[PDB]
């Protein structure tokens, strides 16, 4: 029932390994903010508005995937008006781009040379992952090499 549906919302979004009084106190805040609101254009169009903002930043087939999935999702409309508010807030290969040597019915458009320099940034991203990792190994120990006895260690606290 509905007095449990906010509490189960409270449990799943709380991880684990006080925090045993906090669940029961946070369902109180869940009801206390339910009735702050209650005292005081279709649904699919907002999804079309976010897919447009995908298309401006590139990634066309992804926006086409969003819309082919919401055309069958018309068969829930009160869920999407909530979904669009949590689509901006987050947590706190293919070979057919530049290949014509496959198929038999394969396009002729010749060269590109307008994002083939951004086909080398495709490799710059991969090397920039594996160089940011070696930057996150040298700092987590350089914070250790300069330290003092028992300032972060509670073993001196015994």
């Amino acid at each position: 029932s509905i007095t449990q549906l906010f509490d189960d919302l409270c449990e799943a979004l709380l991880p684990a390994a006080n925090r045993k009084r906090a669940k029961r106190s946070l369902k109180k805040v869940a009801y206390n903010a339910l009735f702050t609101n209650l005292f005081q254009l279709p649904a699919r169009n907002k999804i079309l508005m976010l897919s447009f903002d995908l298309r401006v930043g590139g990634l066309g087939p992804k926006a086409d995937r969003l819309e082919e999935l919401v055309e069958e999702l018309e068969a829930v409309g009160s869920v999407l008006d909530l979904l669009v508010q949590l689509a901006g807030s987050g947590p706190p290969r293919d070979y057919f781009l530049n290949n014509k040597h496959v198929g038999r019915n394969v396009p002729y458009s010749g060269y590109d040379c307008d994002d083939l320099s951004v086909f080398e940034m495709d490799v710059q991203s991969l090397i920039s992952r594996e160089e940011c990792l070696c930057h996150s190994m040298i700092q987590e120990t350089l914070q250790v090499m300069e330290a003092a006895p028992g300032t972060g260690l509670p073993t001196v606290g015994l």
Binding site: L9, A33, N37, I47, A75, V76, V79, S89, P91
Partner: protein, 59 residues
């Protein structure tokens, strides 16, 4: 109805996963049921956003 509501839940899982929402399968089904009751979505948007800040200060 039941096969069609299974299919519409699956499609609803996919479009919230590529949009990279912090929610999961279970909390999607909870929120879907809460909106299926007739509860105002504008109020649920507050409790999810304030929970997802307030639960981290505990850990």
């Amino acid at each position: 109805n039941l096969n069609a509501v299974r299919e519409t839940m699956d499609v609803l899982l996919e479009i919230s996963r590529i949009l990279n929402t912090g929610l999961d399968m279970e909390t999607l089904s909870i929120c879907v049921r809460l909106c299926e009751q007739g509860i105002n979505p504008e109020a649920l948007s507050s409790v999810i956003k304030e929970l997802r800040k307030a639960t981290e200060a505990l850990k």
